[PDB]
Every structure is written in C-alpha cells, then in structure tokens.
Amino acid sequence: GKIGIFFGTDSGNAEAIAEKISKAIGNAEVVDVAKASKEQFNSFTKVILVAPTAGAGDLQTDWEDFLGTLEASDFANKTIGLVGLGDQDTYSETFAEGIFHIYEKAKAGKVVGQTSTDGYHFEASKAVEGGKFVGLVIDEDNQDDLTDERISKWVEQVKGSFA
C-alpha cells in the first residue's frame, strides 16, 4: 500500500531480503530501482532502502544510477530505513558501506532503524555513524544463518516509526 521498499541487486539476494521485510512489516510495495523513477520515490512518504555493496564499498550499480537522479530534498520529508548487505570477511575495511552512499542523501530525513555494530567482525565501515550502523546490516556470505532473526528484530524495532 504505502511503505515503499526499493531494492537494487546483482545477485538477487537484496530482492529476496526486500520481500522478507515486506511480509514482516505489511502495507508495503517492493520496487526495483532499475525500473523506478524520482516520481515513484515521491509516491511514498515512508521508505525502506535495500542496497547491496558492490566491490570495495561501492553501491550496486542500479542503486547508484537511481540515487543519482535524486537529491536530498527527496528524502527530508520522509521516514527512511536503510538495509545494507555486505561481506565482513572479504571487505573488513569497507563492510556494507554501500548504504553510506544512500545515507549521504537520506540523512536529511528521519532515518530510523540504526543498529548495533555488535555481532559483526570488521575493522572499518563508513556505514557506521556515531557508533551505530546507519541501518540494518545483513551478511549472507558469512552469517546467512542470522538473517531472519535480524530482519524480525529490526521490523519490531522500526514498525512503530512506519505508520
């Protein structure tokens, strides 16, 4: 209905994460940023942004392209939850930093859903602002076994913020 859950993906795991979140929270629409516009973004007041990290801290390409047509005023009057995917073992110094590029614009808004850096093993990530990850962080390469627990707790954490 009215929560817009925007994903971008090369592997498909971000779409499957978006759908899991959508089933959990309810009243959402799941939309591929590859097929979406500034117009579409602004047809929601509340959003969850699901973006995997590509290479050493870049944003997945579709997300990069889409974010490029949005400016910070497109976020300021919205509630925003971010969901990053990353691989803490391979990219310990740039872990799930994909979402940070989204955060550089989205932090104008009401960003909700920050999570504890606890339970992840890594040295650095710009995804971390003021002691917390800016969003939910999933690592399907190394902690695929924690992904459902994580989504469940995160939805309980933000569900009230989404209305």
**Which residues in this chain contact Cl ion in the complex, by CB under 5 A?**
9, 11, 13-14, 52
Nearer to Cl ion, 52 or 57 (CB): 52
Residue 88, phi then psi, degrees to nearest 5: -65, -30
CA distance 7 to 48: 9
Q: Minimum CB separation from Cl ion for residue 7, in Å?
A: 8
71 vs 148, beta carbon nearer Cl ion: 148
What is the number of helices (H) and of strands (E) in the chain? Answer: 6, 10
Rounded Cα distance between 19 and 13, Å, is 10
Q: How far apart are CB 5 and Cl ion at their closest, in Å?
A: 14
The neighbouring-strand residues paired with 115 are 133
Q: What's the rounded Cα separation, in Å, for the pair 100 and 11?
A: 20
Whichever of 13 and 22 has its CB closer to Cl ion, that residue is 13
CB of 12 to Cl ion, least distance (A): 6
Q: How far is the CB of 71 from Cl ion (least distance, A)?
A: 25
**For residues 8 and 109, which CB has a smaller minimum distance to Cl ion in the complex?**
8
